[PDB]
Amino acid sequence: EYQNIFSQVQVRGPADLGMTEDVNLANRSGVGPFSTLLGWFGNAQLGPIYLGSLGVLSLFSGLMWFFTIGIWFWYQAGWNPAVFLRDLFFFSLEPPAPEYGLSFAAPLKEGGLWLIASFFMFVAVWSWWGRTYLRAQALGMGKHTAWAFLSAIWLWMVLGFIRPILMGSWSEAVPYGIFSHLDWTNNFSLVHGNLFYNPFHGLSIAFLYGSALLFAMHGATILAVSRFGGERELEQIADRGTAAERAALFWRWTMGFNATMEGIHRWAIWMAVLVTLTGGIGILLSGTVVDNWYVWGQNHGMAPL
Amino acid sequence: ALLSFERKYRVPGGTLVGGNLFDFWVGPFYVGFFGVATFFFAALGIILIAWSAVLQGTWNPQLISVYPPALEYGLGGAPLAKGGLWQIITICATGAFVSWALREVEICRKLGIGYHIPFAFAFAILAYLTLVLFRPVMMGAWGYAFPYGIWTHLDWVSNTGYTYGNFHYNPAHMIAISFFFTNALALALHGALVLSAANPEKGKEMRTPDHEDTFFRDLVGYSIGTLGIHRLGLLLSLSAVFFSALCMIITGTIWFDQWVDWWQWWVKLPWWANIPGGING
Amino acid sequence: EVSEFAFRLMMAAVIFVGVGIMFAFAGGHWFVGLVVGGLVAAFFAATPNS
Amino acid sequence: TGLTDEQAQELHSVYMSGLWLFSAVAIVAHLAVYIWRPW
Amino acid sequence: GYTGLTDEQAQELHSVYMSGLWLFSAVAIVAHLAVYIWRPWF
Amino acid sequence: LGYTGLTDEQAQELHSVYMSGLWLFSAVAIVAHLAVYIWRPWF
Amino acid sequence: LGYTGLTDEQAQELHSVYMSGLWLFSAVAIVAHLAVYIWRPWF
Amino acid sequence: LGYTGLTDEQAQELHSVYMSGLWLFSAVAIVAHLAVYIWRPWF
Amino acid sequence: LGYTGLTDEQAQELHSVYMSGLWLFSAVAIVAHLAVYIWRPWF
Amino acid sequence: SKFYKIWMIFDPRRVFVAQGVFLFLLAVMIHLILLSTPSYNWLEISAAKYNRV
Amino acid sequence: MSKFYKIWMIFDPRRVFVAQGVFLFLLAVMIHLILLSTPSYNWLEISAAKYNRV
Amino acid sequence: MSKFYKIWMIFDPRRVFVAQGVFLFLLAVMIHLILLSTPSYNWLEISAAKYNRV
Amino acid sequence: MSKFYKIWMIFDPRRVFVAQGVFLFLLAVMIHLILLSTPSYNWLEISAAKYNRV
Amino acid sequence: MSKFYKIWMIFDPRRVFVAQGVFLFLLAVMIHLILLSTPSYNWLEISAAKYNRV
Amino acid sequence: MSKFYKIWMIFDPRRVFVAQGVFLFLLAVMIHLILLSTPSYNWLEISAAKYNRV
């Protein structure tokens, strides 16, 4: 009857400081508090966190980005805490107006402060990518996380930097707001015909649904075979046990083919990087090559015409 | 035919309906009672799709569409060429899905594993049934369901969304999208981490789960663990699908207006309703 | 038999509904009831009695 | 099953005593209300 | 006893709890008397 | 009793100092209420 | 008793310096409020 | 008592240097405010 | 101290080099500001 | 007519907590229903009696 | 109340006291909010009206 | 007072003092915000009306 | 009175100091923002109006 | 006063100095931004108006 | 100046130098962007205006 969804007994010992492969231990912190809720679901220990030079860079730039957007929101609220709470999710930093193009001459109230915040955010995100690469390297691991993050960065860069330059205007970029960037996506789909008829939109949606499908499948399988110690997959790769065998046989008797304890993770990483990569391509194509996706679909056998 | 380790697991037991009857394999597949049922329903649905394509007059697989009955039929039968085929295909699709889930249960109990996978699949079946059965039945007609076509069910999505203005102002929609995005992020991170531990720098030994724990503790200051990450993936996927089903079931049944107008209850709270500043003032 | 956690969750749900209606009447808005009831219900359910 | 028969007897007796006290207060309250405004 | 707390401890705890409840009720009674003098609701 | 570990004398002394603090806080509140009631009464 | 752990003679000196800081902070606050009230009273 | 591992002498010298830095910073800020107030008083 | 391990002499020499760098950077900044102010004053 | 065996079947703490919550919630809902009705709203009829409004 | 301390040997006093304090505060806040809702007993509006504070 | 000193046999002083501080501050803020929300007793607006600040 | 120092045997001084500093700064900022948002006591605007800056 | 130096036997000077630097920079940036957003005290626009730069 | 060299007995110079470099570069870029954002002080646009580039 136990479904292994929540832990039923929770044990604590000395905190684990981690490995020392070639990490600079002076740049680590201490262990944080233990948390019983996280212990119910997963691990209870918090920390230690590594903070080196790239971490200082990322923290400074991201803090400045968050602070710039927040101070703009406070200016819009009239420095009123009540108005700030009420109209939160309604404030936004807008990019420059279309008349200014790509120029950096737009005023602070119009689009200059958006440019400042965007510079801060660009630096923060690229330094965080460098941090993921260097943290993988210090421990001697492969850089799979860095390249998957690079896929995500590719979509972010297309949305905020690459497509506005190809279109020749900063006004093409995304505002910094909660409802405002949602309105931005709706207007983007409306201006460019119907984004449903962008085929790379369709591929991106296929791979998003595929991520949900695959990782429900995989989480359920690991939970189902965890009675045999299936969740310790790194040693099921080195020493195949009955858990991996039973998982493979379930999926082979069900859908005709199966995976390994490592090939399934290759499937996983590719299924997610593909959603973000195809999305980047589809957004870059919108407006620069196709200005009306429904008409493109009519010309390409996708709409009745 | 068999995997190098498959032979010892193929034993006579664990069926739900029938006994030694239907207790055999066809190639790699296991075909029980519900295997036969699944095959029948799926083949019938696929042939009926092809026959609907014949009726419609198109052979382009991207233009084939099977439409539900018009609103004038309500929740009753329709002529085959004018909505009856859609109803038959819906019954076949439901039967195929439910028989697939029951076949998976039979495989689970033949292999001695838990039934997490059929439960997770049942969540998706319930989302499909929400879109095709529960919401049309509450709304009063089969024509509120979506058509069976590659690019026309996207037309259904577009029209249904734009009936209520901009659709990602629906709150449960916001929750479902957040869960979907978080799930894709978690899947990418998990696959990358496992691969990087199993495939280190060239000439290195394999890493251990301690190295993975250390990698994410160095990166973000917290590691959820292996059991934790698999529980998280299952729950993120299921919560995404559950909240999508909810946001659709409340859409044409309780709500009827633009959702951006729903968000005005927060703005019109009595203690800041009339303060003159900001966006809504 | 039912677990102590399960009993806490049943009684937390009924307390949530009760206090929610209670403070949605007391306050002018249903959001006040939702906030107060959800806070009380979370506190009640997070502390099993065994 | 954690209680014995004696313990159950005593618990039930005290609980009924309290319940009858509560009912008595409810009776006098209902009578006061009915005198104040009959229904 | 589920708590394991003995009879004399229960009696003493109940006596002090009753004294506190009486003090609380006396304060509430005088508050109601003052408000009734100010604005009767009957 | 053994719930917290404080003995009888410790609990008594702790309550004495706590009551001192409570009365100081109450006296400040009473003066504040008197000032506000003089300025703009609510009765 | 000291749950965090400080001798009574450590606690007394920590409280003495804390009172010094509190009184300095509050005196600066009184002067600021006096200046603001003279410039623009709120009563 | 010395939760940081600093003795009385180390703390006194540290505080002396920190006070010197604070007073330098405050003098610069005071001069900046004086210049701005002469340029554009806010009262 | 034991925080970093530099001795008094090492720290003094390090601070001398750091201050030379700071004064060079500030001199360049002052020259730039003087040029800009002659070209376009902001007061 | 024994009826004391309910303390056998269920834990007394669960019984006490459940019935206390139920009784308090029921009394509160009855009071809210009385306040909602134009009659028996003792505050409003008190205002009408003494011409408060 | 011949013998009611049995509830004290059944219930852990810490939990009972926490629940009682939370419950009493909530009940008082509720009655106050109800009185503030009704214009007849909103003592702030009563004071504003009888002192001509508009 | 009479016998209340024994509450500390039951409740840990750290928990009680933290909860009490949070409760007192939130209560004070709530009462202040209620007074600010009424057009009367809003000491900022009534001082502006009294001295003709607008 | 005269024995409040014992609070430091109950509370860790550094945790209290951090919480107190954060609390005081947040309170001060909140009050300053409340005064800025009011048309009265917005010192920048009233200084601009007095000296004819606009 | 004379006895404040003992704050350093409680707080680590390194952590305090880093938090203090971040706090001071963010406070200064916020005040400069507040002045810039104000029509008056926007020194750039004031100099633009005085010298007829536009 | 007086005794500030002891700062290097408290802080690791590597961390200080990296933090200074990051802070100084980000601040300089922010100020330059603010200057480009003002219609005055945008050296490119005003050179264009004074030489009739556009």
Ligand SMILES: CCCCCCCCCCCCCCCCCC(=O)OC[C@H](COP(=O)([O-])OCC(O)COP(=O)([O-])OC[C@@H](COC(=O)CCCCCCCCCCCCCCCCC)OC(=O)CCCCCCCCCCCCCCCCC)OC(=O)CCCCCCCCCCCCCCCCC
């Ligand atoms: C004719 C047209 C069709 C073209 C193709 C047709 C040809 C036939 C089919 C070919 C398909 C083959 C697919 C098989 C690949 C699988 C290989 C693999 O997974 O393992 C092997 C190998 C490592 O295996 P391993 O056993 O795990 O190694 C362990 C190591 O010991 C230790 O680990 P490590 O340190 O060595 O590194 C581990 C990592 C390492 O693998 C890598 O190093 C990948 C390098 C990053 C990707 C390169 C783009 C970056 C930009 C260039 C700048 C850097 C270049 C230099 C890279 C440094 C390499 C030294 O391995 C991984 O598994 C990572 C998987 C996730 C990678 C996702 C990368 C997405 C980045 C998004 C970029 C977006 C910008 C442009 C988008 C497109 C523009 C329109 O990984 C790879 O080789 C990855 C290949 C990267 C593919 C890039 C994507 C192509 C996108 C094109 C989309 C279609 C175009 C349509 C649009 C057209 C517009 C006009």
Ligand code: BCL
């Ligand atoms: C009316 C609205 C339009 C529409 C307009 C758009 C537009 C416009 C876009 C999409 C995009 C996408 N849409 Mg669409 N979309 C519609 C209908 C749908 C439907 C549906 C059932 O109807 C579905 C399922 C989807 C699904 C999808 C996704 C597959 C895809 C986004 C991938 C992603 O993860 O982005 C979210 C992820 C990112 C943006 C990457 C972020 C990475 C960076 C590095 C993160 C930085 C974080 C920052 C530092 C955070 C600080 C955080 C703190 C540390 C906590 N759309 C309709 C037709 N959609 C995108 C796309 O690629 O399309 C091709 C896109 O741009």
Ligand SMILES: COC(C)(C)C/C=C/C(C)=C/C=C/C(C)=C/C=C/C(C)=C/C=C/C=C(C)/C=C/C=C(/C)CC/C=C(\C)CCC=C(C)C
């Ligand atoms: C819409 O409906 C409206 C609101 C109009 C009306 C509806 C109304 C209702 C439903 C009202 C319900 C009112 C009730 C149910 C009130 C009950 C109030 C109670 C239960 C009060 C008890 C107060 C008791 C108090 C403060 C006890 C204080 C005890 C204090 C110290 C004693 C602590 C115990 C100790 C010290 C002993 C120490 C330990 C040992 C071991 C000796």
Ligand SMILES: COC(C)(C)C/C=C/C(C)=C/C=C/C(C)=C/C=C/C(C)=C/C=C/C=C(C)/C=C/C=C(\C)CC/C=C(\C)CCC=C(C)C
């Ligand atoms: C919306 O509501 C509005 C805004 C309208 C008004 C509502 C308002 C409220 C609810 C306001 C709250 C006001 C309060 C309650 C303010 C708190 C004021 C206090 C109590 C401030 C504390 C001041 C104490 C200060 C700065 C301490 C200075 C202390 C020191 C330096 C301590 C030194 C300690 C040391 C050095 C180490 C020595 C160690 C040894 C061993 C000797």
Ligand SMILES: COC(C)(C)C/C=C/C(C)=C/C=C/C(C)=C/C=C/C(C)=C/C=C/C=C(C)/C=C/C=C(\C)CC/C=C(\C)CCC=C(C)C
């Ligand atoms: C919206 O609200 C507005 C913005 C309108 C107004 C609200 C305003 C507020 C709330 C303003 C708050 C202002 C505050 C709270 C200011 C505190 C400013 C401080 C505390 C400044 C400290 C200056 C101290 C400075 C730079 C440090 C000088 C320190 C030194 C050089 C460090 C040397 C110490 C040493 C080296 C180590 C010695 C080593 C040995 C071995 C002896």
Ligand SMILES: COC(C)(C)C/C=C/C(C)=C/C=C/C(C)=C/C=C/C(C)=C/C=C/C=C(C)/C=C/C=C(\C)CC/C=C(\C)CCC=C(C)C
């Ligand atoms: C909206 O806000 C606006 C932008 C309008 C205004 C806001 C403004 C603010 C808040 C501006 C604050 C600006 C600040 C805080 C500037 C601080 C500037 C400093 C303090 C710069 C220090 C520069 C120091 C520099 C270049 C020196 C680096 C020194 C070196 C390389 C020298 C080498 C030292 C060595 C090598 C050790 C080797 C010796 C041995 C024995 C190993």
Ligand SMILES: COC(C)(C)C/C=C/C(C)=C/C=C/C(C)=C/C=C/C(C)=C/C=C\C=C(C)\C=C\C=C(/C)CC/C=C(\C)CCC=C(C)C
């Ligand atoms: C009291 O609260 C305080 C004030 C303390 C802080 C609270 C703050 C708030 C309320 C912060 C609001 C944060 C929000 C609401 C952020 C919205 C973030 C979103 C949702 C962004 C959504 C899409 C953004 C996208 C794609 C950005 C893409 C950006 C880029 C690639 C960066 C491009 C970099 C470049 C443009 C400009 C190039 C110029 C130079 C000099 C390199």
Ligand SMILES: COC(C)(C)C\C=C/C(C)=C/C=C/C(C)=C/C=C/C(C)=C/C=C/C=C(C)/C=C/C=C(\C)CC/C=C(\C)CCC=C(C)C
């Ligand atoms: C409109 O009306 C609304 C709707 C807003 C709500 C209406 C009404 C209500 C429900 C108001 C609530 C009023 C209440 C119930 C207030 C509670 C006030 C209390 C309980 C105040 C306690 C003040 C006590 C204070 C400051 C004591 C602090 C004590 C200390 C310094 C002394 C501690 C020092 C010590 C302990 C060392 C201990 C000794 C050793 C040996 C360790």
Ligand SMILES: [Fe+2]
């Ligand atoms: Fe896994």
